[PDB]
Structure formats: structure tokens, C-alpha cells
Design a protein around this ligand. Structure first.
Ligand SMILES: CS(=O)(=O)Nc1cccc(CC(=O)Nc2nc(-c3c[nH]c4ncccc34)cs2)c1
Ligand SMILES: CS(=O)(=O)Nc1cccc(CC(=O)Nc2nc(-c3c[nH]c4ncccc34)cs2)c1
Lengths: 395, 395
């Protein structure tokens, strides 16, 4: 409350990589102001014109120095999606190899939803868990948002499952790491919402990390979230998150445990338990899990694996994990000899990636519409404002 | 090269002279919030959501950063067209200052200057005992503030109004003006408005120049190119007076004209080109050759009369056309009580006898207008982004 304390408090607020007003967010704010005002229509205003004239030389210097997309050499497009694409890239100067998620600022504004990336940035940047893919640098430009993360050369669980008939001992491993990776996110106060094999990545050692925190939400004072959002491909989604079509309720971290059952069922049975041709067909079967969940006759599935799946594929009220992680960990399906929960990431993985080089992309299938841009505004529309403060740098 | 790019950018945020230091960056965000926060503009989701997101933060910033509520006003010790000066005390530090306020509204409603920028730099970076020092500069949606050192000795106007100034005192006050003007010139500026109103006295009784509002930096030829007259009617020089569009190319000799006007006033008691009407004063300045006369004042010496006439002549033969040393060498300054190089260390003619730290005896006492709510983005706070002198300052 003293004068110096007020100065120091403000000075450290500019240095904090978690602050809303650090030098990177502050710069982002100016960079946006220049992007959204520089139009002939708006420049007819002297306040606007003189401002833009004054900061021209400077804003350009900043633009050149600050991290830019041209500082990375793209090696392969190792992933795609609605709004963006992931790409194996190499930093031209440092020579370091990374995975970079691009997100079109145009599309996110056209199709709304432009707040999902906020939890994706914070989780990866501040998590500090060997269970979460790490964000090194987040930066933007008039067209996209960029996330420079650690490259996972082992591929995703989708690829693994597609190449092996997963034995129970491997499934017990991959599930345990998911239980731990999920518990970490929960410990950070987040619900993943869409846990699936596509989001389970393998490091050089063959150990798991969760990725694609796009669907994440921060839990309230009672460890709960609420949404009016529509979810695509409901295969891994829980009956609660589906009954939430319009904010028609709340749900806790037990929604992530449902998806784990779906992941265990898939690795051992070979298919998703509620699969149907149409999306509406999948939804109907999830709602009717009581009667739709069935197992095949080839009892290549143990008594305890069948039990864990059914303990996870039940209504929230009696779902395993409603009373915390320790009741999942204590399950007989996890009873083994090879590992101990507290040292599982130090154990030797079932599948160890044998890799050719630093840029080995063998586990990632290669990838093959023109760029749509924001129109010239007649008035101030401030298209850049929803992304002010996205820029992150690690020291 | 990398790292050099980081360092270059880091030093750009620290520099108190940079366009993108923390002060300017913080000002930019503070402006964006002030300017967008209107019900009309908030109808735009990009704007509304941005504001909603940065509400908590912007308010924290506003509370920590220097604000007008931090100072307890003691007396309005001065007024002007756009602002007012006020003796104030910092509520926290207990420190006593003089604060110049400038209505952001009045300025925007036809200013034709942006004078406040050089007034800021001269006072902040001058580092002369001849220039009033700026400690902090800050703003808000309504005003610009300059927190400077309080001059308790009053101005020369007050002194002249209370004493029949003897020649020995006039020789002192002139010499200090010659030195304080030379310092501004050495910084590459022409004061353009030298008058007793801008001569202030410190606790010791020594001079400092103030009100650098009319200042302008000289070109590499030591000249200024103004299409319009600047300064005060009595003290304006014939060349700064005539100063047309195509013409108006004057040097630092315009400050020497005003010194003659100051010397004449202290010894004679009136301004030399004084006339009833203001238009009468103009006519007499132009016709200085015939209008400058002295009364039957036996008390004005031969050398005082000569200095005045050496200063009250056409620029082409004005004393000081060949530098300060020809003014300093003048016989009027010949004395056995001080030496030019040690004059500020000598004992003043009038030493202020002051009651306390807040003694306002030398200052006589003096006893709404605002921007309309905009329907569209008008950006009224943009011309003042970067005014603040607080976070990145020169210590
Ligand atoms: C659905 S959308 O259109 O809203 N967004 C969107 C667009 C394109 C792709 C995706 C998937 C996705 O999230 N991919 C991710 N990949 C990593 C990663 C980190 N390291 C690695 N190493 C190898 C390989 C991938 C990684 C993290 S999240 C999402
Ligand atoms: C005409 S305008 O509206 O464009 N500008 C404007 C508005 C208000 C006042 C004035 C005069 C003025 O400039 N006064 C100044 N006072 C100090 C100072 C510094 N220290 C001190 N101590 C005691 C007493 C005054 C000081 C510096 S400049 C000019």
C-alpha cells in the first residue's frame, strides 16, 4: 500500500508471464490497434491517422523483431482440423525441431467459438507435467495464432491401435498413464471434455502425454463446469456432456472418466462401444448405454477389464472416480507386477519408438481450399481484439 | 540474428525515450479501454467481449498506476486557457509539488500545436538548475498532468509588482535569464515566449525558466520555420511578429529581444512598447526604431540603456547574433559581487523567508467542459498515448 510497493507491484505485473498486462500482451494490444485502424475509411479521422503515422516506423520494427511465422522452416503437415493445422517445423536459427499448431483468426471470428484457445495456451504453457505437451512460444499475426510445442515423435494412440491388436498388459499401461495424465489436468482445475486416442501422444521413450486441450474448461468453486456448446463426433463423449445441449446442466470431472472406459473398450474390443454410421446414431446409443453396451463372445477380455469398462460406462452417480482417483487406482484391472503407479513414467514402455533422426516423421501420415481473408471495414470492427494477450515466450 | 533480436526488443521496452516503453504501452491499453467503453460501441461483440475480459485487469492497472486522486490539492496557484497549475501534496510520500493540468478536451477542440510533448521532454531530460524539473507525467480520460518541482519564491511578475527594482538586482535577474536561456539554446530549443511570468524563484531566490509550452527545436542551421506568430504581445520580437507562411525563418535571437523587454520593464516600470489597446502594442513593436524611448529616469545608467537598445534592435544587428559571450562581455554586467561561472552559487538579492514546505505567500489565489459520448469509434485518447513519465523514467 506504500508508494514503492505500488510501483514494484506494477513493475512485476509487466514481467509476470501469467499477467494480463505483461510486455507481450501490452505489445499485442498496440499491434492490434495498428492492424484494426489501418484502413483508408478510418484514417479520415485525424486522431486515428496521426496515431498510425506516428507509430508506423516503430510498429514495423516491433513486427520484425518479435517472433514471426517466417522464423520457422516447415517440414511436414502432420495434422489438420476445421480451423487449423499442426505442422512439424524447425526453427531456422536455433535448428531446434518443434510441432506448431496454426489457427486461422478469420475462421474463428466467422464461426465464433474464439475463446477455446485460451485454456489450450495456459494448460500447455504453465502445466509443468510430464503428462502435458509443453508450449514454448505462442505468437500471432493478422491472419493466424501459432503454438510452438514439443514434438512427440511416437505418434498418437490411433496409429498404435491401428497397427496392433493391443494385448491386455499394454492396455493396462496406456490406461494407467491416461488416469495419471487426466488427474494432472484435474489437479490444475480443468475438465478435458473430449479425451480420445487422437489426443494421446507418445514421446521418444514411448510414454504418454495428453494433447489438444481445445475442449478444456476451468472448473468452478465446486469442481464443476456448464456449457451451451455443440460437440462433434460423440463417440468418446459422456451422457452428461451430451445432455448439456444448451447449458441444460452442470457436470464434474467424472465426464473424463467415461471417455477412459471408451478408450479401454476400444483397445481391447477393437471398436468404440457406441459406434453407429450416422452421428445421431452414436448419440442414441450413448444415451441408452444401459442396453447398448455389449461385449463380444471371444472372452479375450478378462473379468476385471470387463468390470473397469462397465464401472466407467455407467451414469455419473455411480461412476468409478466419483470419489476421486484413488478408487480407480485401487481397481483390480490395474493389479500388476511390472509397475507401480508412483514410478510408471520411469518404467520401460510397451512400444518404444525406434527413430531415424531428430525429424523422423514415420509415425505421422503425410498431408495434402484457398485462404479466406477479413474484408476491408468501413468502420472500426476490431477483429484483432479477441486475441490481444495470446503471445507467450519462454526464457 | 536471434538473442540480438530479443535484447534489441527488451531494451526498447526499458528506454525512457522509446515510443514502445512500458509507459507508452500501458497508456495504449488504458486508451483502448477508455475509448471503447460506450454503450453504442459495446453493441459490437469483439469490443464488448474484449472490454469484459480486460475489466478486472484494467481497473487493477488504473489503481496501481499514478492517478490524480493520489495528490491532495493545496491551492490553484495558476491558470491558463487549457489548464491550471496547482500546489499539491502527494498523499503517500508527503512530498510537495506543482502540478500542471491540461484539459484533453480543450486541446483536441483546436490546439494547432501538440506543444505538451516538448514541454514534457525539456522539463524531464534538461538536467539544468535553470529549468523546472518534471518528476512524473500521467493522464486520464479528461486531463494530462505534469508533476514538477514547486518554486516557492514566486515569479518575477510578483517581485516587480512589490519592489522598485534597483539596477544591481536587475543585473542579477538578467544574468540568470541569459544563463537559463543559453541552456535551452544548448539543448537546441528556442523558448519563443520569454517573459517575467515564466521566471520562477527557488527557495534560495535563484531563477529557473518555466512554461516551455511555446518551445521548438532548431534545425541544423539553428533556425525555426513557423508560418504563424507565437509568444506574448509585449515581449514578441518584430520577426516572430511578421513571421508569414513563406517567410518565418528565425533563430535564437528572438529570445534575446524578450530579454531587452524584461530589462526595460524592471528598470522603467512599464513595457517599452506598451500601449492602451493590444493592437497599439503591435504597432509600436514594428516601429521600435522610433517608439523605444526612455523617461527622465536619472537612475537608468548609460550601460543599462545601451544593453536594452542592443537587444531592442532588428535581428541583423541584435546583441547575441554572434553568441552568448558577446552579451556576457557587456559593460552592464560589469560587477564585483558575482562571476558568471559561479552566479547560481552567489547569495540572491531577495531570499524567500518561508513559513513551511507548503508556504504559498508568493502566489495569489484563483477560484466541466467535456467530450461528448461518441456514437462510433473516434479515438479521442490516441493523440496522448505515451505521455506518461512513471514506469520507464530517467534516474
Ligand atoms: C479442432 S480445431 O480446428 O479447433 N483445431 C485444430 C486444428 C488442427 C489440428 C488440431 C489437432 C491438434 O490439436 N493437434 C495438436 N497437436 C499437438 C502436438 C504437440 N506435439 C506434437 N507432436 C507431434 C504431433 C502433434 C503434436 C498438440 S494439439 C486441432
Ligand atoms: C495557456 S495554456 O492553458 O496553454 N497553459 C497553461 C495552463 C495553466 C497555467 C499555465 C502557466 C504555466 O505554464 N505555469 C507553469 N508553472 C510551472 C511551475 C513549475 N514549478 C512551479 N512552482 C510554482 C508555480 C508554478 C510552477 C511550470 S509551467 C499555462
Amino acid at each position: 500500500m506504500s508508494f514503492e510497493t505500488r510501483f514494484e507491484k506494477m513493475d512485476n505485473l509487466l514481467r509476470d508471464p501469467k499477467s494480463e498486462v505483461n510486455s507481450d500482451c501490452l505489445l499485442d494490444g498496440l499491434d492490434a490497434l495498428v492492424y484494426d485502424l489501418d484502413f483508408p475509411a478510418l484514417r479520415k479521422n485525424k486522431n486515428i491517422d496521426n496515431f498510425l503515422s506516428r507509430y508506423k516506423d516503430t510498429i514495423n520494427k516491433i513486427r520484425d523483431l518479435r517472433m514471426k511465422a517466417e522464423d520457422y522452416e516447415v517440414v511436414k503437415v502432420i495434422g489438420r482440423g476445421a480451423f487449423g493445422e499442426v505442422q512439424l517445423v524447425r526453427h531456422k536459427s536455433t535448428r531446434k525441431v518443434y510441432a506448431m499448431k496454426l489457427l486461422s483468426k478469420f475462421e474463428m471470428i466467422k464461426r465464433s467459438d474464439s475463446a477455446f484457445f485460451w485454456e489450450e495456451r495456459d494448460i500447455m504453457a504453465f502445466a509443468n507435467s510430464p503428462w502435458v505437451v509443453q508450449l514454448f512460444y505462442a505468437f500471432q499475426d493478422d491472419r493466424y495464432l501459432y503454438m510452438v510445442m514439443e514434438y512427440m515423435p511416437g505418434g498418437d494412440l490411433v496409429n498404435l491401435m491401428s497397427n496392433y491388436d493391443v494385448p491386455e498388459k499394454w492396455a493396462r499401461f496406456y490406461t494407467a498413464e491416461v488416469v495419471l495424465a487426466l488427474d494432472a489436468i484435474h489437479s490444475m482445475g480443468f475438465i478435458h471434455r473430449d479425451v480420445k486416442p487422437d489426443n494421446m501422444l507418445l514421446d521418444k521413450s514411448g510414454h504418454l502425454k495428453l494433447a489438444d486441450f481445445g475442449t478444456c474448461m476451468k472448473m468452478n468453486k465446486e469442481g464443476m463446469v456448464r456449457c451451451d456448446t455443440a460437440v462433434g463426433t460423440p463417440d468418446y463423449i459422456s451422457p452428461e456432456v451430451l445432455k448439456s445441449q444448451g447449458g441444460d446442466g452442470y457436470y464434474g470431472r467424472e465426464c473424463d472418466w467415461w471417455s477412459v472406459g471408451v478408450f479401454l473398450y476400444e483397445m481391447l474390443v477393437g471398436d468404440t462401444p457406441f459406434y453407429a454410421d450416422s452421428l445421431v446414431g452414436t448419440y442414441s446409443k450413448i444415451m441408452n448405454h444401459k442396453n447398448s453396451l455389449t461385449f463380444p463372445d471371444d472372452n479375450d477380455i478378462s473379468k476385471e477389464a470387463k468390470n473397469l469398462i462397465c464401472a466407467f460406462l455407467t451414469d455419473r452417480e455411480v461412476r468409478l472416480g466419483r470419489n476421486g482417483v484413488e478408487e480407480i487406482k485401487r481397481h483390480l484391472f490395474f493389479k500388476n507386477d511390472q509397475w507401480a503407479w508412483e514410478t510408471l513414467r520411469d518404467t520401460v514402455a510397451p512400444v518404444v519408438p525406434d527413430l531415424s533422426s531428430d525429424i523422423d516423421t514415420s509415425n505421422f501420415d503425410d498431408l495434402e481450399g484457398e485462404e479466406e481473408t477479413f474484408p476491408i471495414p468501413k468502420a472500426f470492427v476490431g477483429n484483432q481484439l479477441p486475441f490481444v494477450g495470446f503471445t507467450y515466450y519462454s526464457n
